[PDB]
Amino acid sequence: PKYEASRLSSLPTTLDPAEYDISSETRKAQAERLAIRSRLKREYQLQYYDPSRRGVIEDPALVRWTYARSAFGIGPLVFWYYVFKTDRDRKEKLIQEGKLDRTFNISY
Amino acid sequence: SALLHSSTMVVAGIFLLIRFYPLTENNKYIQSITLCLGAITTLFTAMCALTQNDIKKIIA
Amino acid sequence: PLTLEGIKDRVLYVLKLYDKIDPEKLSVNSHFMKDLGLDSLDQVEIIMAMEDEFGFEIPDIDAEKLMCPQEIVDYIADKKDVYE
Amino acid sequence: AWRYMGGFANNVSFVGALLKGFKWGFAAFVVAIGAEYYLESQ
Amino acid sequence: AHIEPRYRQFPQLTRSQVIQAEFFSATMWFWILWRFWHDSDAVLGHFPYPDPSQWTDEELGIPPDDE
Amino acid sequence: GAHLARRYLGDASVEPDPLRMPTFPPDYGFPERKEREMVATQQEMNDAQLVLQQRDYCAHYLIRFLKCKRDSFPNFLACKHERHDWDYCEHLDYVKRMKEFERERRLLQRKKRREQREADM
Amino acid sequence: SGYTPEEKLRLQQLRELRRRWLKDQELSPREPVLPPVIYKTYRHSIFAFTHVLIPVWIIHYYLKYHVTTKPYTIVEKKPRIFPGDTILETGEVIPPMKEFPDQ
Amino acid sequence: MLKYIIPTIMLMPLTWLSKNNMIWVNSTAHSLLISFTSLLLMNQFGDNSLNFSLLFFSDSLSTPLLILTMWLLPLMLMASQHHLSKENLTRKKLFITMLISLQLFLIMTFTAMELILFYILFEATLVPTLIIITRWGNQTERLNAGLYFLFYTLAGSLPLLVALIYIQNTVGSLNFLMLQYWVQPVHNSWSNVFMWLACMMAFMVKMPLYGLHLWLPKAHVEAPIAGSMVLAAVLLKLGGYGMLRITLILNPMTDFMAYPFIMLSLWGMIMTSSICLRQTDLKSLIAYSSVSHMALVIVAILIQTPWSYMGATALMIAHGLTSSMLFCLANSNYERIHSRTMILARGLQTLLPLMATWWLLASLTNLALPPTINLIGELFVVMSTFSWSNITIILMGVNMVITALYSLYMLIMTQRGKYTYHINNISPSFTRENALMSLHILPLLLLTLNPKIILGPLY
Amino acid sequence: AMPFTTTALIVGSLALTGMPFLTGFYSKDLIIEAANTSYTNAWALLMTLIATSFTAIYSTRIIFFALLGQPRFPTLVNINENNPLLINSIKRLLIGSLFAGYIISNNIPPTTIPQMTMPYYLKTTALIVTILGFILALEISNMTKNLKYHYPSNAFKFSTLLGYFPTIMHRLAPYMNLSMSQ
Amino acid sequence: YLTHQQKVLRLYKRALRHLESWCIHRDKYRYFACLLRARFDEHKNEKDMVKATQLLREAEEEFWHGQHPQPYIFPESPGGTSYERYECYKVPEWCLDDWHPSEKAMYPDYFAKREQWKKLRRESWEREVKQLQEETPVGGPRTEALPPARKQGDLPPLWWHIVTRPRERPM
Amino acid sequence: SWDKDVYPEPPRRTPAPSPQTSLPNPITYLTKAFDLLVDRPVTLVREFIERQHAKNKYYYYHREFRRVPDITECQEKDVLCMFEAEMQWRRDYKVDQEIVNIIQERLKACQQREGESHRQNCAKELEQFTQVVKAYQDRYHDLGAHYSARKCLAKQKQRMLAERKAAKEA
Amino acid sequence: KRLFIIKPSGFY
Amino acid sequence: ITKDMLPGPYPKTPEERAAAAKKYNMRVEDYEPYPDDGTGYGDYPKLPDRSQQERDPWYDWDHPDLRLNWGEPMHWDLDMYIRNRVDTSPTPVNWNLMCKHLFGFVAFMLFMFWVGETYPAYQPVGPKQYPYNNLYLERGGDPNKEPEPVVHYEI
């Protein structure tokens, strides 16, 4: 029985058919990815290991993230309006008729 | 875990219902609900315990 | 409390209970491939016994590099903060 | 091999584990009902 | 410490731990035997359960059928 | 058990309904049937502060046991005979409820037989 | 798959530093340089005095002269009365029960 | 009220005539003395309010808000003096003057008998508040925050002025004591529908009502610490105080006019609580938390029950201390790492053990742990809205769960986990900061012993 | 290797599984008897009884895999229970697990009328199902020692992964809530 | 990124660990471990690399079907019961800079030795930065590997945070 | 210390000790220890304090509010009369709240005092509680947070009109 | 042997 | 940080895609924006919807608790994918099968409880009998009214 991936449960890497057919193009892309990672690692490390540095190492990726993120509207109000309005009309009708029990109700 | 599971938190839920037995003893509908809730609970969790390998989880 | 000699004693002790290794040829510097004639399957099983001996996991990326008893002693000493 | 040798060679069974202490618990019990049967006869 | 670790061997035991364990294991079994001797009905049944089929129609007040 | 198999997996017309018993007059088949006699008075059960569910036809044995239990403190192993008398009265009380069930069951069977006699006639 | 000669040399150089660093975390003999059954019962006796007797004195004084002086602050369940008891306040005797049928 | 107005005014010459290096000592010390005397306002009677003069009065609603106002001024001074240390002396004195002038307008606003006087003072608070944000905020978009804050307010406040002047013409007076006796019922008509909206929308914007709330997170992200403190603790409650007063003359029209605002509030409190679970700016998270809490206050005021009004009063006081404390806690991290990003500096309990305790206590009050006055106020509202309609318990209960989730999420994210490796400037907490946190939480928790002084006139 | 810990664990397990006259027996068997003779939901009664059987199985599982057989722990033996704080604290609870149920049951006033008349098969149900649970558990535990390899069944995975309730609910519910803001 | 040889060896180790979770008993595990090894030794000399990749892919399909749903995890491995347990006690060494002078006075020997390390760090840094400039091609590093020191008295570049990291059991 | 008519309690009936055992009662010896070690020193401190109190006897008084005309007698918009009537109505409202609180305290004390016999023996308290709550509900319920003597009167007149109509249809 | 425990300053 | 380093509008031409990939430290082959709607993602990259729990725990992350490296682009929903929140890791049992087995188990139990209510267990006895008209006065009945007698008989 094959694995069926879901949004909340990914395909395992050992079962992914593209993990076993790795061509020159795929290897070249992985090297380009490792090179980008290594360049950022060095840039981070020259500051992180700098004995004279005291502070925070500002991360442009973090700043871009918070900037990007800091940058179903009447239907529930109408829905809730009819739920509470219908309930309170029913309740008000019974009190006027005396059919609602409020024997010990003196806090409101 | 020893104190959470024995003399403090988890029995509080049971204790609350015991405090209110003057009301629950006159309510068959409430009795049916708590009965079935406990029954499914006692069986389901005991069934989970049969295969657990972590000693603390078996006791939990 | 582990010591550098204590770790080394137990690493060789485990290897001296492995039938594919002759305990007379074994030293701390014996390469598992070049001196003892083992294969990489064998090397994986040696690392697994070390993990069992000391009760912690050696990730595959590090484990593949450990090719003699001394490199295992160094690796265990470094992760356990053993300086003596 | 060390796991099957020395002080680990023989371990009790499940029944033997449950019966740990039975011998002296029974000996003490026999003495107690014997004592209680004697006094009750007085 | 007062107990020193051992390698691939059964551990060192004190005489206090062994005796105390045996005492309380034996206490548990004495208690069970003592209680069972005196309160076996707590396990087996406190009273006889009647067989309703053995009751007569006279005592249940069942009149004869042709009546 | 067994009585449940007869009702749910058999003929329920001749099986008592536990929520509607009894369904025959108490004196049907019992000429001169005595009443159950209550020993403890209402005031005695009130003063003893018995739980309402304990204020039944065995309450006098309970009142005796509770008084013994208080008087024997700290000896919490005494009053064992008083407790058995209360437990025994409850047992007999339970047997009486079993007989009421068995009487009801047989009267429902007699009625069923008396209906095939007429269905034949 | 073993180490390369440069990987081994870097690891060796780091190892020497790490062990020297770890050795230097050991304290010296003078560190820290700090600024300038009777015992059983006495320790237990002082504990009972401060943590039981003094608190109970305070609580009793508080319950007796402030709490119980207000209506319905400490409400008791009234004592159970059994057939045959004698009331202390009045001297009343509670009649026995009716005689039991044999059982 | 002159015994509070005049000494507050005298804080201005005190600050300007102080020795250069004594401006924070003198202003802080003397503002604390004014705060002490504010407790004389507790002479409240069971029947009558404390009516000083033809201009000012103090009942059990205004008194707790007055005490909170005058308590907050020294705290804002303490909180501000560090990030203003490099400012030149004249601009420091001008900053302190804005805070003093804000106190002056606020205590007059809360004690005015006549509603036009309340309106002018209610409007006057805008000026120093706007100046504090646009002049002493750090970032470029403080200018936009000022315009949003300014024009949201005036979009609602100008209709209120027209309604207030209209009411005086019809009734003959706007003295609040007179309105209590000459109030007449509001009958159904389109004219009265717009009178109702004109009487209420200005206060809705201040609270802020859900759907008119987007100015608030914008304002907080731009304001300096003192700006956030006064905004969160007092300025929002001007709208709450205004609604509690003006609803007197809006019956029985409030019966059906409240519905759309109750729906916005009841649903809005769930929406804003959920939004807090995904906020990445710590100040913006606290700002959205205020919106959710103030939604309860709006519901309490609109359903108009004795229990709801008591809960509204307690919630307003309790939120003011709690939210002000959270901005102060958030600001203490900011003064070290110079970022409001919540995920930047983690595991701070390892580095700042006692500040972790303050974070814990602020979070516990934010999620309304019994018996904090935070829970007392929330519980009373939950009690009263259940009678209004039993189904509301579902939305109230769900909001409690989400509030606990984001309150503790804040605590776990910043204080727990591992510390960020490269942040190596987390210096030990200063005495000033520890005192500032304790000067919020201690009075807040002491109010548990005597809640009646914060439950308002319906007590 | 750990005698006192072993004694307390055996006592605790037998107390848990309703061993006659230990502390647990004085409540569980009254509860099972009261349930057996009550006007009750029949399905709930059966579930409770099967669960009583299952208690025996997982208790045997702890005892069997922790105390019996051969050591499966690492080679450096640091087993040591000879600490008075450890022995004494467990000792006081071990005494509680023997007599507390008996002492408490003989001192508390009666507030109900306990059911004491019932058929023998309702009287002994908890004991019988408990004994069958132990017997069943011992056959399964010893089958792990055979040189046979077993594939996982669906019931095994359902049990091991907790009916999948945590996997589904703890991924889906947070995802739906944490996403609906956007 | 992983070679074929690395994937097979990773699978063997992963398969053996799950097999142990199933077998539990050491004698039973030894028996089945040897059978498992014989399955790998069967195809050890497969020179057709398309066939070898098919063998591994089916092997990983087999592993996914037969894996233990609750495998044993070493306590301090990721996902284990002691993983990260001691992180709360790890305190970075820069925190000592902020100690009050009276606190530092309690450990005069320790803090004098700490100053020597800080001096060693300061005097080494420029040579480390220079060594990395000389050895890094124009495009920048293509990998994350760092070099050893090449002279006497040099320290391996970027050593401080490795050498002075918190102890695994710091308190 | 308080009025026994306002907060009544029935006479107390304590049975005498009646031991049916030769074992000593631990509670009796703890009681004697409590008297000697706790009560007597506590009583000695209190008697010293009361001796200081007797040297300085001074009094406080319960404030008496004259009755003033009700809102029914106030001309419309006459705030001087309305003010006094409104203040009087507010004082009465607080008093009626405490009257209900007294009756609820009676009920709760009876429930605890009567034990397992409360359902029968607390009927008189239950009835008095039922009536005062009904009267209190009629006066003050549903007025809203902006309550007043005016709104209270409007409710009474609405109730009076409903009672007049119902009597007419009969 | 006794090892120095690195912790944040507690003096303040 | 300059404006050119901050998130921008959705990339229109292929030369804006290359600039956007470079700004976010990505290969232009890998870079891919969110679909151009009014949703408001701009040019922020759309990265795989995976939990941080799925990352290699042994790699030397700059942020080990988050498993992020300094400078790498962060998933738009990173705050949802931290290790304390939503996990997307592969499961030993397929997602759909798990849902069936859990739903099937709960549904079967709820049905059986319904059956157990309709055919309850009980014992073969009649009602429990109480004296004094089923304890009329004790249960709170009106003393002034006279209850309709309940009479119990011996059997």
Ligand SMILES: CCCCCCCCCCCCO[C@@H]1O[C@H](CO)[C@@H](O[C@H]2O[C@H](CO)[C@@H](O)[C@H](O)[C@H]2O)[C@H](O)[C@H]1O
């Ligand atoms: C209220 C009273 C309750 C009943 C009280 C009964 C008294 C209990 C007395 C227990 C004392 C027994 O003392 C203990 O007995 C066991 C008998 O196997 C001894 O054990 C002995 O045999 C076992 C092997 O089977 C091994 O441990 C070893 O060969 C030897 O020690 C312990 O070494 C001894 O310490």
Ligand SMILES: CCCCCCCCCCCCO[C@@H]1O[C@H](CO)[C@@H](O[C@H]2O[C@H](CO)[C@@H](O)[C@H](O)[C@H]2O)[C@H](O)[C@H]1O
């Ligand atoms: C006739 C109608 C007008 C009535 C005017 C009544 C007030 C007259 C005040 C005259 C004195 C002014 O005093 C003059 O200004 C300020 C404050 O006073 C002083 O200088 C000030 O410098 C700084 C503030 O910047 C502070 O240290 C301190 O406030 C003070 O020393 C001058 O050294 C003094 O020469």
Ligand SMILES: CCCCCCCCCCCCO[C@@H]1O[C@H](CO)[C@@H](O[C@H]2O[C@H](CO)[C@@H](O)[C@H](O)[C@H]2O)[C@H](O)[C@H]1O
């Ligand atoms: C967020 C904003 C929320 C806004 C909520 C809006 C609520 C809308 C309320 C609608 C009711 C308005 O008020 C309504 O006005 C009309 C005016 O013609 C009144 O009715 C009056 O005019 C109509 C003419 O059509 C006549 O038939 C009627 O005899 C007369 O009395 C109603 O008596 C009143 O009920």
Ligand SMILES: CCCCCCCCCCCCO[C@@H]1O[C@H](CO)[C@@H](O[C@H]2O[C@H](CO)[C@@H](O)[C@H](O)[C@H]2O)[C@H](O)[C@H]1O
């Ligand atoms: C309420 C608490 C009640 C506690 C009740 C305790 C119940 C204990 C039930 C034990 C039933 C007997 O269990 C029996 O043990 C013997 C031990 O030789 C075993 O019998 C056989 O099986 C195993 C495995 O093949 C062998 O190790 C054993 O030598 C052999 O005789 C079985 O495992 C089982 O048939």
Ligand SMILES: CCCCCCCCCCCCO[C@@H]1O[C@H](CO)[C@@H](O[C@H]2O[C@H](CO)[C@@H](O)[C@H](O)[C@H]2O)[C@H](O)[C@H]1O
């Ligand atoms: C005393 C215990 C009392 C409670 C006992 C409860 C047991 C009730 C179990 C009900 C759940 C059964 O759930 C059912 O299982 C089978 C077997 O996988 C599934 O069947 C499906 O999956 C299997 C395996 O992939 C395949 O045959 C195929 O995909 C499909 O048939 C059904 O889709 C599901 O509906």
Ligand SMILES: *C(=O)CCCCCCCCCCCCC
């Ligand atoms: C006789 O006294 C009945 C006692 C009950 C025995 C338990 C039977 C459980 C059967 C399962 C019920 C299925 C749902 C209707």
